[PDB]
């Protein structure tokens, strides 16, 4: 790999500056070659590779939602081969992304904090594969089975108010209701969600209200 | 090249798919490949042509003042390396366009609009490897070349509110201030160019209000 002849931590270092530039691609693929040293990662590195990759596949995402609407408002062949160009680039990132995570990183995973965030990550790229494909049950429920693994995990092994158990909860809650064609049961994921960390926050000494104001947002639109 | 085997009409008509979807790597690369049919760029082409490179190289330029203040504060070897590595790519998206320029597009261009717009922009590309360079010298001396010979033709050939002949004057401005160490030359500039625009401005049925605005922005800071 491209990466393989750099130094671990040099890896780190770099994708910490392409952060800072803004290089979103360049960070992933440093983090990627940080993956393929075969060490674990540390909590702030998992969250370096999370934030890469969710950058570059959220542009790509966004994109392809916009060549689709085109699309969809046509009906030459320009506008599908284009579209369909950036849905095989996307695809080609998600199978990336559940690569290392197949690969390296989930079976390796053994705390609850890195194992649950790994699943949601993989039942994210599931996801994101589900938006663009039509096939598409299989993706669907490749997702489904992997968020719920990190949900039986995290209701188990972490408080109601940790901020991965929250990220996973929303994303889950979204999957049902944008993906899955279950509005009742992502309001009712949301809304428990949002009323056990309330009831958390008590034991507690800035990622968690945000996303508990992420759920109750979601929740204002959906109810 | 990897776009000669797509019509020129789909290449542009992707261009502008590119730009609804804001992929100007797609944009750039779909716009070299037109260039390369060998035909004459329309008013509308070059337009698209300027904002695809000019988004590519933005975000690189910006990416590079980050790393290089990162740099330009720690004074091992990452930051440099991964500076150089922005940088290097910067070069090759200039030196690139200028040879679209080069071998293409400047010596068939005849009318005032098209053979000013082009000079501005091989003006802008040298600026930006200026902006990098440390060499330097002649780099410079070739921006300040282009801008000079664009700057005489729109002032025999365009109206002073034309809006290339004021973004011309605009960045040639900006070159003299930030490139060539010559902040008084860059208000002259700025001033005559505000000040012949606006007695011009009776002769007219929204670029180059923005532009004179600029202009003023400029000079404000400036003086
Ligand atoms: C190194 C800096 C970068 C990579 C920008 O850090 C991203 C962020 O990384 C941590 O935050 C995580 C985190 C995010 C927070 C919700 C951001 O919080 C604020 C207040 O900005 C969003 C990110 O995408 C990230 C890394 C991702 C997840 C998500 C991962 O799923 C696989 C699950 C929920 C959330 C968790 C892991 C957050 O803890 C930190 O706790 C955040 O800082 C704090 C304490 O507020 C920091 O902004
Ligand atoms: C196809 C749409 C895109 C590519 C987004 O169009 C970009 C823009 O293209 C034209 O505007 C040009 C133009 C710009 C205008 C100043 C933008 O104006 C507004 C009001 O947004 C900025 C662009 O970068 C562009 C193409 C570039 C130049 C620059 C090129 O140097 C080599 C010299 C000055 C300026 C000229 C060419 C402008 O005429 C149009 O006149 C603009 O629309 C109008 C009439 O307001 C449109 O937004
Ligand atoms: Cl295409
Ligand atoms: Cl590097
Ligand atoms: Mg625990
Ligand atoms: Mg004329």
Chains 1, 2 share one sequence.
């Not at 770099?14 to 990662?41: I, N, S």
Request: hydrophobic share 40%; net charge negative; proline share 2%.
């Amino acid at each position: 790999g491209a990466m393989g002849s750099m130094e671990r931590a040099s890896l780190i270092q770099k994708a910490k500056l392409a952060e800072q530039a803004e290089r979103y691609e360049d960070m992933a693929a440093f983090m990627k070659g940080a993956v393929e040293k075969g060490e674990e990662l540390s909590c702030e590195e998992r969250n370096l590779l999370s934030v890469a990759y969710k950058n570059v596949v959220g542009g790509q995402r966004a994109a392809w939602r916009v060549l689709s609407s085109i699309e969809q408002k046509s009906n030459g062949p320009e506008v599908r081969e284009y579209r369909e160009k950036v849905e095989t680039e996307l695809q080609g990132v998600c199978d990336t992304v559940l690569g290392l995570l197949d690969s390296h990183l989930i079976k390796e995973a053994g705390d609850a904090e890195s194992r649950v965030f790994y699943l949601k990550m993989k039942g994210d790229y599931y996801r994101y594969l589900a938006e663009v494909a039509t096939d598409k049950k299989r993706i669907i429920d490749s997702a489904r089975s992997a968020y719920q693994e990190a949900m039986d995990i995290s209701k188990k092994e972490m408080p109601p108010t940790n901020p991965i158990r929250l990220g996973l909860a929303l994303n889950f809650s979204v999957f049902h209701y944008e993906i899955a064609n279950s509005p009742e049961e992502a309001i009712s994921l949301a809304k428990t969600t949002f009323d056990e960390a309330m009831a958390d926050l008590h034991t507690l000494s800035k990622d968690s209200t945000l996303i508990m104001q992420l759920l109750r947002d979601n929740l204002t639109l959906w109810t």
